[PDB]
Amino acid sequence: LRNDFYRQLVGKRILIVVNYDIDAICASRILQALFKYDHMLYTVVPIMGVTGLKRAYGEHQGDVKYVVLVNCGGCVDIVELLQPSDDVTFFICDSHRPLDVCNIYSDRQVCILGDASLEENIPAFETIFYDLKQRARRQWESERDRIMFEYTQFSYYGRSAALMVFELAWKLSKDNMDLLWWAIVGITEQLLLGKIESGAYTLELEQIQSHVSRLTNKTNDQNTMSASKITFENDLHLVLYRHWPVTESMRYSRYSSCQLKLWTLRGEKRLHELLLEMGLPLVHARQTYGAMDLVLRKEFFSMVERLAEKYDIADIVYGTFTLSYGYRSRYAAADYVYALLAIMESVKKHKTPEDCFLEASDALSRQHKQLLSAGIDQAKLLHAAVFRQVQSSLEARQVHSAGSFFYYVLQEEHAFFSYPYALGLLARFLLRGHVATSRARQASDLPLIASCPLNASEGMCLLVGIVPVREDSPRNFFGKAFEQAAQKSGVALLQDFFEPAVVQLRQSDLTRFLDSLTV
Amino acid sequence: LGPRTEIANRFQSFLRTFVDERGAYTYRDRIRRMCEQNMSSFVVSYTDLANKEHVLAYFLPEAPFQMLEIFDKVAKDMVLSIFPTYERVTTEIHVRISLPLIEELRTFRKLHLNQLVRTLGVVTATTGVLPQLSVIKYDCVKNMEQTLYRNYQKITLQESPGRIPAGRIPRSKDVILLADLCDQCKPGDELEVTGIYTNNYDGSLNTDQGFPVFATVIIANHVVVKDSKQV
């Protein structure tokens, strides 16, 4: 509840828009507007790491007390870090979810937007910030069965960033259909069960539906061009259906690749033998869907929904949205998020990251739409430069087992991969390839680790983490796992990024780090 | 022709019922293979054909072309009946044969006209690949548009420079190919063909000079490359 707090927001302020995410601009551009709505001038932040926290804020030692927190909170007993707080209020809407109870109380300088049916963490203040010696430790450890089961076993993230702001705002006589699209941006940002879980997706089939299947404020005369409100249909999050031909999906898609084995040949013969059953032509299977003839393009999903029932891929039907403005197009919300990462370009100007952040935040406007096309372009070639290591690897087998996980190392960087999060993708593309498919799953379901050649930043062995698949919701030990060798030895380690699952070693102090970390 | 009744049965009872060589006969799969490659050249072997029923060598030559009609109707009625999915795109058909007996140049004569043939050749210069006309339409007043086509190229063959009859002249014959069996001819190769013998539709039929100007012409149902110099 901020119906009482929001109305305090008239004085000076800052709108931090926190460390790297799509969630940021989605849940802020709304309010970079709303500030001039209340006749408030706005002020924003490029953040890349907790690095950025006080090298930016320390430049601003004031008392501007209407303050944001997103994507952080798993940081410090935040007065102990943000000590220049005397009564300076903060406002949190963070997704960096599992927070310590040091940070809520002293309940002047924070606001608790936390309410859940999980009441399991109460005496942590009655244990840590309160703690004869023997029994104190008896409590300490026998309840750290639960407490250290928090914050020393795994980590995860929660819910939206401005769906709260939607919940505030649909009451305030605001129906920014565009901003509902922005909400969907934030949805498939990380609520995609392909990335991080919803589960209740199947019951948000009602939620925003009931928001807008309610609402057609022009229920009788809605046949105009601009800003026609959006419409629900059961659709895909297969890779980039729209502007490239079917065969590009049928190649560059994982949920084929995990179930159909496409990088090899029998994938292709088998594919053809299904395009028989669809009876689509081959030219027509190699022109952009928007480019093809029509009745095939029209009748596509009508057949594909049903007579894909039988062929090892059960989970291609999803629930999604898609729209245009006028007559140039029909965009799709899922045909955007893979464009989003395209300006996340890690060039060696020092200008690129922040100014590309400004560019992206300039992007989600209807007025600013030219540039997005170039992003789509880049994404396609990225998706096909994936292969630039896949078959060379999965057939050469760079794979390392290395005990009770699987082990990978790349040893040469890509300008493609200076931007880091490729390191998550290729893992999630290829463990399928051999380590899942040429075997039973018994050697398949373990997570994986991925070196990161830093050919540009002097050599620092960047990393990200991975789960086993088909049991995803069981949170990542990697939230902790890599503290192991850090805790056993510790070796030039940083946790400079917002995220737990991210680290930075030295170029050549990584193997003994492993042999420590093997366990 | 009530005879036409039984023939397609003997096909239809044959393309999707037969098994040879310890199962999964090609005819179950060649069509779909063809269908998956959009090829329209589904093949028959006469040896298998005579293994089932050699009757198709003796009611054939009174007109093998009506035999080929009675082939294509069956094939069509198999594809779009089984792949009505297919009913969009090209949706026409013909088949191939490979009577696998080598017979030779310089023997086709008075009694080899328009009948069951099997011959080779060796290729040399000919033209590009171009189209033709196909259909009966032109009228409405009381047509040279929207009138379907079919590609064309001219042949020229030559004969073996090895098996020659010792100073007998190397010879030459004018022969045809057609659209689907096209864009595979090049100078200096040989190609084994099913083959079939006729003349022009009308090659200068008249009181004329002291000898008629008559030609003799062939096309292939099947061509199987004999040279195949890559994999």
UniProtKB/Swiss-Prot annotation, chain B:
Phosphorylated by the catalytic component of the Dbf4-dependent kinase (DDK) complex Cdc7. It is found in: Nucleus; Chromosome. Early fractionation of eukaryotic MCM proteins yielded a variety of dimeric, trimeric and tetrameric complexes with unclear biological significance. Specifically a MCM467 subcomplex is shown to have in vitro helicase activity which is inhibited by the MCM2 subunit. The MCM2-7 hexamer is the proposed physiological active complex. Component of the Mcm2-7 complex. The complex forms a toroidal hexameric ring with the proposed subunit order Mcm2-Mcm6-Mcm4-Mcm7-Mcm3-Mcm5. Interacts with Mcm10. Belongs to the MCM family. Acts as a component of the MCM2-7 complex (MCM complex) which is the replicative helicase essential for 'once per cell cycle' DNA replication initiation and elongation in eukaryotic cells. Core component of CDC45-MCM-GINS (CMG) helicase, the molecular machine that unwinds template DNA during replication, and around which the replisome is built. This is DNA replication licensing factor Mcm2. It comes from Drosophila melanogaster. The gene is Mcm2.
